[PDB]
Design a protein around this ligand. Structure first.
Ligand SMILES: Cc1cc2nc3c(=O)[nH]c(=O)nc-3n(C[C@H](O)[C@H](O)[C@@H](O)COP(=O)(O)OP(=O)(O)OC[C@H]3O[C@@H](n4cnc5c(N)ncnc54)[C@H](O)[C@@H]3O)c2cc1C
Ligand code: HEM
Ligand code: HEM
Ligand code: HEM
Ligand code: HEM
Ligand SMILES: O=C(O)/C=C/C(=O)O
Ligand code: NA
Length: 568
């Protein structure tokens, strides 16, 4: 067969997959996937037949109900979504190499003669709020607005939900939570505020950070009330105390949080449309939003009439060309992001009249696994790992900010460093088992062996750990002044993860006020237009603190959802 449909049509009718009229049920291909499931079983059940020791196409960390058509198209060869970050040994029938080729919003100007057509038609739907983007902000905003009584349509341009949010690992910052107090941590919203302002070099908009710190405990409560487990509280860089909340044992905060929001959305029957890209915010003749034109991958262009559009589209850290224009030093770097985190949501906010701010501050995460091409959480260092260079020496306060950590690693020989930890660190953070599973955490029972495996002087490495452990014992890092020394690295085996900075987060984005309203260049609110999450600028100034983005998208998404419901 040349394609999956052709393969099946040797012994099946078209309506084995299609509706009776043959029309695609919708852009999520809900009906069609239901047919794949009716014969092949759920994803879990498919997974059983495709196990590999350390990976499985059908049993991934992606939350929500991942459609089969996310990777298996019927009438054309299709791409494996995991190939956008990994290079696992897959043999998907009818596959084609991963290649993201999505027109920019500007390029879709080529469809004027179909967009105009769409805009002249009746709206496909009429609701109160359209939320664009199914990351943490979008889901929060959809839920929020629905809880407030608004009818929402939540759209997602990828075949899968979660954006970058589902990849999040280290934690969601919040101060003065019950979760913290359960752990004997003392903190305060003013402390979180102060950490964030200095972490962002005082570029941050103070009123936005006030929302961020003051709403954080509320955001953690809200999530917890929805089913989230944010009881593990870890240390992230640039933080005075542990406040990065995450699931018990130190599991990824992101997949979990997005999973909860998704289940909550499903429970509220929120209309969630996959393969549906927001293209252009529609304004009436008085300049308030009147809807949004979207491009359904299978239904084409259509618009939704709504009083409020909440842009929750994430950042542009995967778009290296845009990143390079704003920060020429990040050009050619690998990104930790999902494939569609390319800034099309900012273009949509900009075409609507939203002004942008702080675009030039683009965060590189210091520790992208060299081997794996994926983010290794800062929580690894927060929980006690150290960084060592090829020379086998520490060279930086590993819990400093992402900007200082990146520059320090890039100044090491080979422009990469090694996270070094033991079984005590491993065991304190379950997320580290995911890296051992990826094959990116080589291990050995001695640092000499470990260094010889990775090309780190073993004897230097061994002295470095012994030196580090002493400092942990004495309670002060006089070498690099790492202010939190949670654990000696002397339990069980030792592990090394080769790391180098990757593009990660765009701290710049659409200008919003404390009600998450998008402002134009003359600082005027554009009625009905809201922005939440990484698509906004001003929250994190020049350097976002680890944990603050997940705090931010829940806080701002919830807030946008409420404000929009209310605005109506
Ligand atoms: C690998 C990784 C791990 C991270 N770990 C952490 C962590 O522990 N703690 C932390 O604080 N931060 C962490 N971060 C940062 C944080 O996850 C992100 O900032 C991300 O969650 C921002 O959330 P968001 O809702 O704004 O956008 P995202 O979650 O990126 O979601 C936005 C959605 O919008 C969709 N979209 C975009 N444009 C359009 C359009 N025009 N139409 C329709 N849909 C559109 C995108 O496809 C995407 O799904 C991590 C980021 C990465 C990449
Ligand atoms: C878009 C929807 C579907 C997807 C993504 C899908 C997935 C797949 C794939 C990847 C294969 C292997 C093809 C090959 O080896 O060349 C396959 C085969 C098969 N499919 Fe599907 N399928 C879908 C719908 C269906 C439906 C509706 C039925 C039955 C009515 C079905 C029954 C089968 C059978 C019987 C086989 C051969 C092997 C087997 O499962 O015993 N599939 N399918
Ligand atoms: C000869 C038999 C079939 C015919 C004539 C047919 C017809 C079509 C048409 C016209 C479309 C595009 C609809 C649009 O763009 O609006 C489509 C898409 C689609 N069809 Fe089929 N179909 C057939 C069999 C199947 C089978 C056997 C499957 C799955 C095993 C399937 C699954 C799908 C899916 C998932 C889509 C969305 C796009 C894609 O993945 O290619 N169809 N089909
Ligand atoms: C219930 C949802 C899905 C169904 C029914 C389906 C169906 C299938 C089937 C029948 C096979 C052939 C494996 C075998 O049985 O020999 C397969 C293989 C495969 N599918 Fe799916 N699939 C689904 C979802 C997905 C998703 C979401 C992705 C990517 C994340 C994916 C990517 C692949 C890959 C990469 C292979 C080859 C497995 C390997 O080489 O280990 N599938 N799928
Ligand atoms: C269905 C699609 C995918 C599959 C099956 C998959 C598979 C895996 C596997 C097997 C691991 C090792 C730990 C574990 O077992 O979870 C892993 C880790 C990881 N993957 Fe994926 N991957 C997929 C897609 C992606 C994509 C598209 C990205 C980036 C956008 C990504 C980012 C990561 C990261 C950052 C890690 C490190 C551990 C963590 O944060 O949990 N994965 N993935
Ligand atoms: O877990 C991490 O390393 C990333 C955190 C962040 O980007 O906030
Ligand atoms: Na931003």
């Amino acid at each position: 067969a040349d394609n999956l449909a052709e393969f099946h049509v040797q012994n099946q009718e078209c309506d084995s997959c299609h509706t009776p009229d043959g029309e695609l049920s919708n852009d999520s291909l809900t009906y069609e996937n239901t047919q794949c499931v009716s014969c092949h079983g759920t994803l879990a059940e498919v997974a059983e037949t495709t196990k590999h020791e350390h990976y499985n196409a059908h049993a991934s960390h992606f939350p929500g109900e991942v459609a089969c058509t996310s990777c298996h198209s019927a009438h054309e060869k299709s791409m494996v979504y995991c190939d956008s970050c990994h290079s696992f040994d897959f043999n998907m029938p009818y596959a084609k190499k991963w290649l993201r080729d999505e027109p920019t919003i500007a390029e879709l100007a080529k469809d004027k003669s179909e967009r105009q057509a769409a805009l002249a038609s009746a709206p496909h739907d009429t609701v109160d709020v359209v939320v664009v983007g199914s990351g943490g902000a979008g889901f929060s905003a959809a839920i929020s607005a629905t809880d407030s009584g608004a009818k929402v349509i939540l759209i997602e341009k990828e075949p899968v939900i979660g954006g970058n949010a589902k990849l999040a690992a280290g934690g969601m910052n919040a101060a003065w939570t019950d979760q913290q107090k359960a752990k004997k941590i003392t903190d305060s919203p003013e402390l979180m505020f102060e950490d964030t302002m200095k972490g962002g070099q005082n570029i941050n908009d103070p009123a936005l950070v006030k929302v961020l710190s003051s709403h954080s405990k509320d955001s953690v409560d809200w999530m917890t009330a929805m089913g989230a487990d944010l009881t593990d509280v870890g240390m992230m860089g640039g933080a005075s105390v542990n406040r990065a909340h995450r699931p018990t044992g130190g599991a990824g905060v992101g997949a979990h949080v997005v999973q909860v929001l998704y289940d909550n959305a499903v429970k509220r029957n929120i209309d969630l449309r996959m393969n549906t890209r927001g293209i252009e915010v529609l304004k009436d003749d008085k300049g308030t939003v009147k809807g949004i034109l979207v491009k359904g991958m299978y239904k084409g262009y259509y618009w939704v009439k709504a009083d409020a559009v909440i842009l929750a589209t994430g950042g542009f850290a995967k778009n290296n060309e845009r990143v390079a224009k704003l920060d020429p030093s990040l050009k050619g770097f690998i990104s930790t992001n999902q494939p569609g985190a390319v800034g099309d949501g900012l273009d949509v906010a900009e075409n609507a009249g939203g002004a942008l701010k702080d675009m030039q501050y683009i965060q590189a995460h210091p520790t992208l696994s060299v081997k794996g091409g994926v983010m290794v959480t800062e929580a690894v260092r927060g929980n006690g790992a150290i960084l060592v260079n090829r020379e086998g020496k520490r060279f930086v306060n590993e819990i400093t900010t992402a900007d200082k950590a990146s520059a320090a690693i890039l100044a090491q020989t080979g422009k990469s460093a090694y996270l070094i930890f033991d079984d005590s660190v491993r065991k304190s953070l379950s997320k580290i088992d995911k890296y051992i599973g990826l094959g990116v955490a080589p291990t050995a029972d001695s640092l000499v062996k470990l260094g010889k495996m990775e090309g780190i002087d073993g004897k230097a490495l061994t002295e470095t750990v012994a030196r580090y452990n002493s400092l942990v014992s004495s309670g002060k890092d006089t070498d690099f002044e790492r202010p939190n020394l949670p654990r000696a690295l002397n339990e069980g085996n030792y592990y090394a993860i080769e790391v180098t900075p990757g593009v990660h987060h765009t701290m710049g984005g659409v200008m919003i006020d404390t009600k998450a309203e998008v402002m134009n260049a003359k600082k005027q609110v554009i009625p009905g237009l809201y922005g939440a999450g990484e698509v906004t600028g001003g929250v994190h100034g020049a350097n976002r603190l680890g944990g603050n983005a997940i705090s931010d998208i829940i806080t701002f998404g919830r807030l946008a959802g409420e404000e929009a419901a209310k605005y109506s």
